[PDB]
């Protein structure tokens, strides 16, 4: 407990030292990026020791080291829960961040503010680890909104670009709408259970937990970009490719799924929440994969893939399989970060070109980027015994052997086929066929930083899934008896998608011209949701702000019915009082009237 | 309180007897020394307030407000001495005298044990405030702004004077300690309905309450920077502090008299947040931001719960430093381009990189990023209003979203994008401007490490 | 119209004093103004004040209340009494109406 507790804290204290050295101007500004990269590598080592101890005996502990504030009967302490979910996620996140930071050292080399970029990447990770280890809801909320702000500053990295500022603000807008549910969950838990600590919530085990869990689902919807609050993640592609790698594999978008996993003691007893999340994930996984089939920006395809994979994790939550959802979080981190890094390798070599229609013929020109891209694609589509097979395959077989909504199961399977189709698109258009890029060839993937960073994630995408599944303890009853056709549903729908995707890709070569179908336009324009909603909602709210809130009320009616009416009445009365003839005759004639009414009307003489 | 009142008065001889070129150095240095000694007021006890004499006492509510007030005086001096450089020497000393006299009235207002002593000082702050706005404002409209500020306040205060004197007649005392033990319940009647209104309308106008807030954007847009700093940081909190004290004797009538004002605040906060999205004037945007934030304080004071009173106390302190910082940030732009139009000068993060950091930090506190005390105050209020009625989370949620939109819109419009080509007098930020910004944000962020000292008497 | 002075130009404090801190036109006064703001503002109020606040003695007796509660729980549980009774005041000292 001395070694376990000491080591799991240095991991967090280690990551903050580069922040401390930076903001205290005691560092060596020469190669700060390598310093920040080195710190992350060492923190991965120190975080493996507590993980091995958990793997060995299941050792878990809580550390409440500092008493921050007591609000009557609510004590708030800085607490860190080093449990199952924290001990597996921390080394995985650090391992992937280790590769991304090394990759960023080559990708961001020419950026003049590369030192600030690595500082933000480090804060992005620190706020994620605060989120993951938080033992009470307030400390968790610090990490919750920290990743949101760090995401805002990194998406809008190129702040002279209007499109990057719109994307950065859009991410805050959608995530804050999600944060309404988080605040709702906090308010319910404080009111009904008198706590924010995860321990007391689970011990009291509320039965009427519909309201708090709907709040948590709403929060997860924003952070994980489920249907209704989804557009911001594809738009978050404005940021530099290293941001996309870290934003999508770890840090932000996974926090939504992680929040629901942390609360599975409540959700496992509430069937109503399970039905909602299952449907919420199913539409999300289907819709976003449907949008990827026609995207031409290589980063937007991978961005839509993440939304589709997050929808799958939300489905896993919906079927009362929190640990499979967690496993998918871990395995997904490896090959999704690699895919983004492989696309960055292509984009860099093609002078900032991101449209797959303008690539091609890179299969041999970029051999190592091609191998990683194929491995990443096969891992994503659940190829047997690659890292993505150990989470995704189990999820599907649990999905079709469960008491489930029949539509959500059918949507999930079709989206699994769509995963093969858009994976085929990237390979077919980026790597195969004849080159379609400009004539001045500058392809070059020979930087060791690029090669090593991808090489580490490539090994992870091959064995990390196998290693983890064989080391994690079992916390459920895995379903292994089932009909042959339910066992192989994931594999067959994937193969069929590959075959069909290949036929569709080949038809582009034929000398035929076809008018687009309404379905084709619907997929390309993302179901018109960004088009309609990002013009209608801003227009109505902004127009009401000026027309009614400001002018009609504040500049007119609130002025009219008080200061402007009162001051006009006084001005009128002043004129009546003072507009006199200065005639002795009239003044004394009014004295007679005053005296007469004094006696006759008011009897002042009695 | 004489260990603070007297040295505050001695700032006036110091300023007038200083060498012509040392008025700012001397007044700034010695007002910082007074700020240092104000920390001795944090000798607070769990059960009893700190009662010095028959005239003055200091509990956990007034102590943080006193410390905010005395910290603000040096900051206001730093913020003014640039635009007052060409001023006549005597008119510079008279300006400083108005600020010192405002601090004097303020620290006595927050520690008066008797409510009629509180009323006089509460009213006395008008004169120095009005003179600052109308004498040292820059625009024609500063004269109208002075009148709106004066007559909005007096319209409410004069009824309060009648109510307090009536209360002293019937109860026999207005000493706040005595009221705690001699308080009797207020029973329904039209007579008490108007006693309740007279006791609360003067403070509602100062907050301000939505609907009665029109004086505030006028005053801010016309006041000099130092006037805007004290107006937002402290003078608004005279409404909150007064309400937190007087509600003691308004029970249980506050149960139903609160409804019209909770409705105005809950809806008003969404309306004034949305107004910020379409403001063209940077100072006016910040003014309307205060109305939205102070709406939460009004709701929290009126629902009368231990959590809501803790939240209101933290919100008042957090808002004081943040809104004062935002006015100072906008002013530094104004001293360069001499306009308050938000869209006029864009992309300033390219030209003033470090001032863009301050803009970021100020915005993050304004949207209540956890664990800032801005978030602690706003969160505690939201927890208590949820228990008051669950549906309030809808209005609280929307306000949080709109608050983020206009906070980052202000950041993005002024600091990001492309710089305006024809504007070529954006000089590098002065040390004075950077130190002014840091003296706002550093204490504000430091208080997160130890938030109990700004949580008020119910902590 | 009238006989009026034209609007004077903008003075950039950096032109005459490239080392200006923005406080005063006189460089010696400008340096002193900076020194008092930084020494008294940061070195004293913020650093010492922060240290003073951190070591405040049991602000509002929160620690004593925790020590006292421990004493009571230890006593009551040993003697078999309720940890806390619903009645704040001894009911024998109260005289209900009716």
């Amino acid at each position: 407990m001395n070694m376990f507790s000491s080591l799991s804290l240095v991991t967090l204290l280690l990551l903050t030292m580069p922040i401390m050295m930076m903001s205290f101007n005691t560092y060596k500004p020469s190669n700060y990026p390598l310093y920040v990269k080195t710190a992350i590598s060492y923190a991965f080592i120190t975080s493996m020791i507590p993980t091995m101890m958990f793997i060995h005996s299941g050792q878990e502990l809580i550390i409440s080291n500092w008493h921050w504030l007591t609000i009557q009967t609510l004590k708030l302490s800085l607490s860190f829960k080093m449990d199952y979910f924290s001990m597996m996620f921390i080394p995985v996140a650090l391992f992937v961040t280790w590769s991304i930071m090394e990759f960023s050292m080559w990708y961001m080399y020419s950026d003049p503010n590369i030192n600030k970029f690595f500082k933000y990447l480090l804060l992005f990770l620190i706020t994620m680890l605060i989120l993951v280890t938080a033992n009470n809801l307030f400390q968790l909320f610090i990490g919750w909104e920290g990743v949101g702000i760090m995401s805002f500053l990194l998406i809008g990295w190129w702040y002279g670009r209007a499109d990057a500022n719109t994307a950065a603000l859009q991410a805050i807008l959608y995530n804050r709408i999600g944060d309404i549910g988080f605040i709702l969950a906090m308010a319910w838990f404080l009111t009904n259970l008198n706590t924010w600590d995860l321990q007391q919530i689970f011990m009291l085990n509320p039965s009427d937990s519909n309201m708090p869990l709907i709040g948590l689902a709403l929060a997860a919807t924003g952070k994980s970009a489920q249907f209704g609050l989804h557009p911001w993640l594809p738009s978050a592609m404005e940021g530099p490719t290293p941001v996309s790698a870290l934003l999508h594999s770890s840090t932000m978008v996974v926090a939504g799924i992680f929040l629901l996993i942390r609360f599975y003691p409540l959700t496992e007893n509430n069937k109503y929440i399970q039905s909602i999340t299952l449907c919420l994930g199913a539409i999300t996984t289907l819709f976003t994969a449907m949008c990827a089939l026609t995207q031409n920006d290589i980063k937007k395809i991978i961005a839509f893939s993440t939304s589709s994979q997050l929808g799958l994790m939300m489905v896993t939550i919906g079927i009362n399989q929190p640990y499979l959802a967690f496993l998918h979080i871990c395995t997904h981190a490896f090959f999704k970060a690699m895919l983004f890094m492989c696309s960055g390798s292509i984009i860099h070599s093609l002078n900032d070109e991101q449209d797959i229609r303008k690539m091609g013929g890179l299969f041999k020109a970029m051999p190592f980027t091609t191998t990683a891209l194929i491995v990443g694609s096969l891992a994503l589509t659940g190829m047997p015994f690659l890292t993505g097979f150990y989470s995704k395959d189990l999820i599907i077989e649990a999905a079709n052997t469960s008491y489930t909504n029949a539509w959500a199961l059918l949507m999930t399977l079709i989206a699994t086929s769509f995963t093969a189709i858009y994976s085929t698109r990237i390979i077919f258009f980026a790597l195969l066929g004849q080159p379609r890029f400009p004539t001045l060839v500058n392809i070059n993937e020979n930087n060791p930083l690029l090669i090593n960073s991808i090489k580490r994630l490539l090994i992870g995408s091959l064995f990390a899934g196998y290693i983890i599944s064989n080391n994690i303890p079992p916390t459920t009853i895995p379903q292994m008896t089932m009909p042959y056709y339910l066992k192989t549903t994931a594999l067959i729908v994937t193969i069929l998608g590959f075959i069909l995707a290949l036929e569709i890709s080949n038809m582009t070569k034929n000398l035929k011209y076809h008018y687009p179908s309404n379905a084709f336009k619907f997929s390309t324009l993302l179901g018109y949701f960004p088009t309609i909603m990002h013009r209608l909602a801003p227009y109505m709210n902004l127009s009401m702000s000026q027309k009614s809130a400001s002018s009609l009320l504040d500049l007119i009616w609130l002025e009219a019915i008080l200061p402007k009416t009162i001051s006009l009445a006084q001005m009128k009365a002043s004129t009546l009082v003072t507009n006199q003839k200065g005639l002795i005759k009239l003044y004394f004639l009014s004295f007679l009237i005053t005296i007469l009414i004094s006696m006759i009307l008011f009897n002042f003489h009695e | 309180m004489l260990k603070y009142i007297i040295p505050t008065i001695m700032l006036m001889p110091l300023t007038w007897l200083s060498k012509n070129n040392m008025i700012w150095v001397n007044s700034t240095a010695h007002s910082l020394l007074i700020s240092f000694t104000s920390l001795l007021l944090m000798n607070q006890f769990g059960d009893n307030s700190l009662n010095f004499s028959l005239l003055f006492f200091s509990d956990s509510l007034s102590t943080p407000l006193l410390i905010l007030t005395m910290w603000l005086l040096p900051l206001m001096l730093m913020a003014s001495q640039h635009h007052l450089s060409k001023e006549n020497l005597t008119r510079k000393k008279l300006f400083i005298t108005m600020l010192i006299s405002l601090q004097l009235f303020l620290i006595m207002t927050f520690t008066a044990m008797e409510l009629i002593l509180f009323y006089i000082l509460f009213e006395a702050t008008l004169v120095p405030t009005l003179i600052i706005i109308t004498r040292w404002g820059n625009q024609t409209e500063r004269l109208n702004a002075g009148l709106y500020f004066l007559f909005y306040t007096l319209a409410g205060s004069l009824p309060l004077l009648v109510a307090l004197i009536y209360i002293q007649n019937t109860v026999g005392s207005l000493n706040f300690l005595m009221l705690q033990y001699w308080v009797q319940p207020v029973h329904n009647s039209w007579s008490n309905v108007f006693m309740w209104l007279a006791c609360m309308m003067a403070f509602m106008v100062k907050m301000p309450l939505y609907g009665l807030h029109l004086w505030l954007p006028k005053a801010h847009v016309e006041a000099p920077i130092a006037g805007s700093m004290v107006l937002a940081a402290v003078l608004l909190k005279l409404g909150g502090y007064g309400m937190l004290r007087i509600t003691l004797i308004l029970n249980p009538m506050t149960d139903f008299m609160a409804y019209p004002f909770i409705m105005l605040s809950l809806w008003g906060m969404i309306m004034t947040s949305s107004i910020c999205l379409r403001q063209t004037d940077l100072k006016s945007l910040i003014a309307y931001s205060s109305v939205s934030h102070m709406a939460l304080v009004i709701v929290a004071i009126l629902i009368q719960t231990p959590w809501s009173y803790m939240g209101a106390t933290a919100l008042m302190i957090a808002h004081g430093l943040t809104s004062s910082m935002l006015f100072c940030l906008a002013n530094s732009n104004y001293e360069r381009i001499h306009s308050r139009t938000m869209i006029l000068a864009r992309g300033l993060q390219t030209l003033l990189p470090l001032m863009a950091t301050w803009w970021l930090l100020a915005s993050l506190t304004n949207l209540a990023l956890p664990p800032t005390i801005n978030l602690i105050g706003e969160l505690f209020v939201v927890m208590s209003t949820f228990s008051w009625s669950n549906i309030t989370i809808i209005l609280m949620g929307v306000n949080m979203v709109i608050t983020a939109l206009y906070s980052l819109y202000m950041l993005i419009m002024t600091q990001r994008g492309k710089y305006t080509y024809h504007i070529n007098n954006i000089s590098p930020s002065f040390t004075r401007e950077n130190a002014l910004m840091s003296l706002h944000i550093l204490p504000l962020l430091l208080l997160t490490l130890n938030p109990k000292i700004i949580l008020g008497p119910l902590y | 119209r009238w006989q009026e002075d034209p609007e004077p130009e903008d003075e950039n404090l950096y032109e005459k004093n490239p080392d200006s801190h923005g406080y005063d036109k006189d460089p010696a006064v400008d340096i002193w103004n900076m020194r008092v703001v930084f020494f008294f503002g940061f070195s004293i109020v913020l650093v010492l004040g922060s240290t003073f606040v951190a070591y405040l003695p049991d602000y509002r007796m929160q620690e004593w209340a925790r020590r006292e509660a421990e004493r009571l729980v230890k006593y009551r549980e040993a003697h078999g009494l309720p940890i806390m009774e619903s009645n704040c005041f001894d009911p024998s000292k109260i005289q209900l109406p009716e």
Binding site: - | H338 | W2, P8
Partner: peptide, 19 residues
Amino acid sequence: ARQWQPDVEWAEQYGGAVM
């Protein structure tokens, strides 16, 4: 700019027989 001060048009508001 610089601080606004009353000009002749403003001053003539107070030079009439009545306000």
